[PDB]
Amino acid sequence: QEINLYSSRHYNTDNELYAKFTAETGIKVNLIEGKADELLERIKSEGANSPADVLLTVDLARLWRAEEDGIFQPVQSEILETNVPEYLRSPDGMWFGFTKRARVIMYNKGKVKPEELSTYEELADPKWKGRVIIRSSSNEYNQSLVASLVVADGEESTLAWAKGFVSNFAREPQGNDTAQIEAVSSGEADLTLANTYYMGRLLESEDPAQKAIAENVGVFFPNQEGRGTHVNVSGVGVVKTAPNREGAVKFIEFLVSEPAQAFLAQNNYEYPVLAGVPLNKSVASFGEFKSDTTSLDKLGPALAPATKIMNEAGWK
Ligand SMILES: [Fe+2]
């Protein structure tokens, strides 16, 4: 028994995660990693005999586009239904989220006080001129965030926001989320937007250098007075032509079960989807916050206008 996993997850803990699965079920995991868009293209180009059993992403919107293109097959699992909140899985059992991550404002403690922060929209304020940095618009975390702004504020307003946000950049987008945190820590900028688990990793690192970086940067959950902080998920679905549907289903059921949920929360610093599972202490220290649960099912359709907006605004 084996499954062919196509995953856009890119963490050093993924190997142990999959190992946990095999040690529990005896099912071998053949892994193919790459960026979400690349994996979807590969699957579609490989045809009806593609080896792909499971498609794993770190973005809800890409999962939507995958389901739209009919790449998944329905799965009805009692464990999936009970463990995964309805709003975090496909109404037709096409895909399911198994972790949650928040894209929040991370700021230099010495240069910024929390009282000066509020919403994502405010980051376009002239006050932040030459003090903001963020990774490239090509990244899905950013595209999904911009999509949520389109959904909540509209295309016209988001375009205006993006132009202002870009005008505030201290440097052109370079590096990943962690590179942004380090740059803010080093005084190259005062704030950025990154996923919570990246800060969790730095705070929990055995490398003193990483922990030192974390100490200079604080975390702020935006839009608390309104829709809430933008929350995305790491999701998964069984490919329609999966050669081993049985193993594929067991894999997804494994991901949402207590053992895997606890590991993901404790070792990869993400928010588990299963209730009753404790967060990593460092992540717990961020505090409680309101999550945006209303803009989720409309994010996918908003991808197109979001990317158009990011391009027009000059967000490289
Ligand atoms: Fe990530």
Side-chain angles (χ1 to χ4, degrees):
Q1 280 250 177
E2 68 179 3
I3 61 168
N4 303 305
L5 175 66
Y6 282 38
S7 165
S8 51
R9 276 183 76 77
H10 59 101
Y11 312 104
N12 55 23
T13 53
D14 290 345
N15 186 261
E16 191 180 337
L17 175 62
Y18 305 155
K20 306 274 285 173
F21 169 68
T22 301
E24 167 76 6
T25 70
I27 301 167
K28 180 173 186 180
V29 178
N30 299 310
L31 179 64
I32 292 182
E33 303 183 309
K35 291 290 182 170
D37 293 347
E38 289 160 39
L39 296 181
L40 177 57
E41 266 297 322
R42 174 167 179 160
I43 296 172
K44 296 197 295 184
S45 68
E46 293 177 328
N49 297 310
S50 169
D53 278 310
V54 179
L55 174 66
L56 204 172
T57 73
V58 291
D59 179 66
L60 190 163
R62 252 62 183 183
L63 276 172
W64 176 83
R65 287 209 302 210
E67 169 177 32
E68 275 293 279
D69 286 352
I71 96 116
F72 299 122
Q73 62 172 291
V75 167
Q76 168 53 42
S77 173
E78 313 318 305
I79 184 61
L80 296 185
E81 193 174 309
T82 291
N83 287 21
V84 180
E86 183 172 1
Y87 77 95
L88 292 174
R89 51 182 159 77
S90 158
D92 300 282
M94 292 301 183
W95 51 260
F96 316 77
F98 61 95
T99 73
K100 283 139 58 177
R101 52 270 292 293
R103 199 159 189 64
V104 305
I105 295 172
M106 289 190 201
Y107 63 91
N108 179 286
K109 300 181 188 176
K111 299 290 188 171
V112 179
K113 286 181 286 189
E115 63 179 303
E116 294 174 275
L117 302 167
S118 64
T119 67
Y120 296 104
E121 290 87 349
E122 288 295 1
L123 301 182
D125 259 46
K127 169 181 181 169
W128 304 114
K129 179 65 175 300
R131 306 168 65 181
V132 181
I133 59 172
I134 190 168
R135 72 190 301 172
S136 178
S137 53
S138 66
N139 170 261
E140 50 213 290
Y141 301 154
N142 284 339
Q143 305 197 331
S144 282
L145 173 64
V146 175
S148 70
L149 263 69
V150 171
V151 174
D153 307 345
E155 286 174 48
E156 188 88 70
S157 295
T158 300
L159 174 58
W161 166 79
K163 289 178 175 173
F165 187 56
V166 174
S167 70
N168 284 339
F169 288 1
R171 77 185 196 184
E172 236 53 62
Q174 156 176 42
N176 57 193
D177 276 16
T178 296
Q180 310 309 308
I181 301 175
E182 285 181 38
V184 168
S185 164
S186 297
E188 147 270 32
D190 293 350
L191 69 82
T192 187
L193 290 181
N195 292 339
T196 48
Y197 61 84
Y198 287 116
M199 175 60 89
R201 177 189 179 188
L202 292 170
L203 289 164
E204 295 280 300
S205 175
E206 298 206 300
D207 185 330
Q210 286 181 45
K211 288 188 164 180
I213 291 172
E215 173 71 15
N216 296 330
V217 184
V219 175
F220 186 83
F221 298 96
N223 301 54
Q224 297 304 93
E225 304 292 69
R227 58 175 184 288
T229 299
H230 178 246
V231 178
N232 207 334
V233 313
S234 183
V236 59
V238 181
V239 180
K240 186 177 68 285
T241 51
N244 181 15
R245 180 184 189 291
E246 187 186 76
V249 173
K250 279 178 171 56
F251 182 66
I252 297 187
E253 293 179 317
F254 165 74
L255 290 185
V256 305
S257 295
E258 188 284 327
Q261 288 288 291
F263 172 80
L264 290 165
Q266 289 302 316
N267 293 280
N268 206 223
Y269 323 107
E270 297 167 86
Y271 296 106
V273 295
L274 177 61
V277 180
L279 310 179
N280 165 279
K281 64 179 184 182
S282 285
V283 176
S285 78
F286 291 171
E288 291 183 352
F289 63 97
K290 177 195 293 178
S291 296
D292 179 354
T293 59
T294 60
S295 307
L296 295 184
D297 56 299
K298 295 176 183 179
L299 288 178
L303 267 179
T307 56
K308 186 183 183 185
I309 289 178
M310 298 169 95
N311 183 64
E312 299 184 359
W315 186 335
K316 307 297 178 59

